Amino acid sequence: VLTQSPHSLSVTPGESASISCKSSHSLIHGDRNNYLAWYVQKPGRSPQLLIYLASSRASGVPDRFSGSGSDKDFTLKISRVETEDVGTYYCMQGRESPWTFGQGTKVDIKRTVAAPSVFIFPPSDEQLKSGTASVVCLLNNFYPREAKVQWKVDNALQSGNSQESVTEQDSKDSTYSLSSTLTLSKADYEKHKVYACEVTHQGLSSPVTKSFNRG
Amino acid sequence: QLVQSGPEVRKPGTSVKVSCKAPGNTLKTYDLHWVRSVPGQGLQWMGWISHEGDKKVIVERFKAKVTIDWDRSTNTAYLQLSGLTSGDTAVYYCAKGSKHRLRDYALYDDDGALNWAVDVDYLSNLEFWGQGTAVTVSSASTKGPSVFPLAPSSKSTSGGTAALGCLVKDYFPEPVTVSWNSGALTSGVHTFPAVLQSSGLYSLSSVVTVPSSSLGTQTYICNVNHKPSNTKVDKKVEPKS
């Protein structure tokens, strides 16, 4: 197998990033040819080539990218990391068939920790008229991406009826935003009184509960 | 620099034909490759065609329902998915690449002539990629998006800044593009990716943080455009307390 490491990575801007790829079997054939390549897939873009034959830089690729290693141990080194480099990096072998990719490595820009301002929105009258109730909790501009969100209805936590999504890392302040959406039937919505968005995050001094009263 | 066909939507059990190529007769000496990108699942190499044309290999996973080809007269390459399932909903990438071809075995006549020889191909790289083609597989039909307002209130206000937004709910299929004040409002806007609900319809939330000094002063209208249903929607978000 190809085992890529780590699964996630965060780099303070202007520093160095070291991603590893390790093969169970040799990737060398003949003279001194290591058939392992490196790629980037930035958010919203197609994959692009960085390094090939373990150590060779592709055309139009910045000097900060380098490749090293042999046979089994392989390492991609990105130094002087900027906002441009954010995305997912993959290793790829070309020795045995079939040719496979690495499981990927999410490279992130590390900033000083920022707590999220947590917002809450009750279901609109327009939606309740349509027979469904959707409650929205919004966490804005936080770092890191890891945030834990729980939905409490009458202080009984909801499971299996919510789904959230995060924005890509903003290039300006290197922060994320999370939008969680709790969907309830109109019947179930009015059979309950209090609705809360319990949010936990590194930036928070203490777990934050943004709650509203139905009515 | 490779151009591929636009996004595709298929009912389950049907087939989709995806095209891709460089301009003109650009990369004839470069091998053809197909890579699959499932959002949040990783990268997947499907199969390849030698630029010489003596090879056409497909991975066991896709072997049953996938066909790769390339008619050299138009230079244009093709990928075919058949008997589509929901698990085939993914982004498909084409790629041109270089390789190494070194003889691994040889058998000779009793008088010296080469009877039989086998070559082995070693992938060097994939240098040229296409924009990507999104294929969506669902039993759902085209449905216009319902747009509901995320009203700013006492509860959605921190310090001197408040937050509002539109909630785009229950549509098919992607994509939906959301704007604020016809592009005039750019700062502080956060449009999240659509989430696939239990129904098979997508739901989307677009928010923007604004000072509470503006709630009476300024007007905040979201524009929600959805091409497949031929619908553009303008919704004004007001603070109702």
Chain B residues with CB inside 8 Å of A183's CB?
Answer: 197
Owner of token pair 């049907």? B14
Regarding beta strands B133-137 and B8-10, do their DSSP bridges make them parallel or antiparallel, or are they unpaired? parallel
Q: Which amino acid is at B48?
A: W
User: Under a CB-based contact definition with an 8 Å cutoff, are residues A65 and A84 in contact?
Assistant: no
Rounded CA separation B109/B132 (Å): 49
DSSP states of A23-75 as a string?
A: ESS--EETTTEE-EEEEEE-TTS--EEEEETTTEEPTT--TTEEEEEETTEEE
Q: Can you give the three-state secondary structure of chain B, one letter per residue?
A: CEEECCCEEECCCCCEEEEEECCCCCCCCCEEEEEEEECCCEEEEEEEECCCCCCEEECCCCCCCEEEEECCCCCCEEEEECCCCHHHCEEEEEEEEEEEEEEEEEEECCCCCEEEEEEEEEEEEEEEEECCEEEEECCCCCECCEEEEECCCCCCEECCEEEEEEEEEEEECCCCEEEEHHHCCCCCEEECCCEECCCCCEEEEEEEEEECCCCCCCCEEEEEEEHHHCEEEEEEECCCC
Identify the H or E element spanning A186. helix A186-190
> In this complex, is the C-beta atom of B50 within 8 Å of any C-beta atom belonging to chain A?
no
Domains of chain A: 1-110 (2.60.40.10), 111-215 (2.60.40.10)
User: Under a CB-based contact definition with an 8 Å cutoff, are residues B211 and B162 in contact?
Assistant: yes
φ and ψ at residue A106, rounded to 5 degrees: -75, 105
Query: Which residue in the set B42, B132, B194 is minimally distant from A101, CB to CB?
Result: B42
> In this complex, is the C-beta atom of B101 within 8 Å of any C-beta atom belonging to chain A?
no
3-state secondary structure of A127: helix
* CA angle at A32 for the pair B49 and A58, rounded to the nearest 5°: 60
Strand partners, B190: B207
- Shortest CA distance to B57 belongs to which of A27, A101, A96, A98? A98
Q: What chain A residue is nearest to B42 in terms of C-alpha separation?
A: A103
Domains of chain B: 1-139 (2.60.40.10), 140-241 (2.60.40.10)
Residue A98 to residues A2, B57, B236, Cα–Cα distance (Å) = 12, 9, 54
Decide if A48 and B129 are in contact by the 8 Å CB cutoff.
yes
Tokens of B210: 């604004």
Q: Give the residue before each break in chain B, using a C-to-N cut-off of over 2.5 angstroms; say none if it is continuous.
A: none
Residue of B32, B93, B122 to mutate for A, most A C-beta atoms under 10 A: B122
Rounded CA separation B151/A204 (Å): 25
Q: If 0-12 CB within 10 Å is exposed, 13-18 middle and 19+ buried, where does residue A126 land?
A: middle
Residue of A1, A40, A42, A46 to mutate for B, most B C-beta atoms under 10 A: A46
Rounded CA separation B93/B45 (Å): 9
Cα within 13 Å of Cα(B90), Cβ side: 19
Decide if B191 and A167 are in contact by the 8 Å CB cutoff.
yes
**Resolution to one decimal, Å:** 3.1
Decide if A163 and B205 are in contact by the 8 Å CB cutoff.
no
Q: If 0-12 CB within 10 Å is exposed, 13-18 middle and 19+ buried, where does residue A89 land?
A: buried
Rounded CA separation A14/B236 (Å): 43
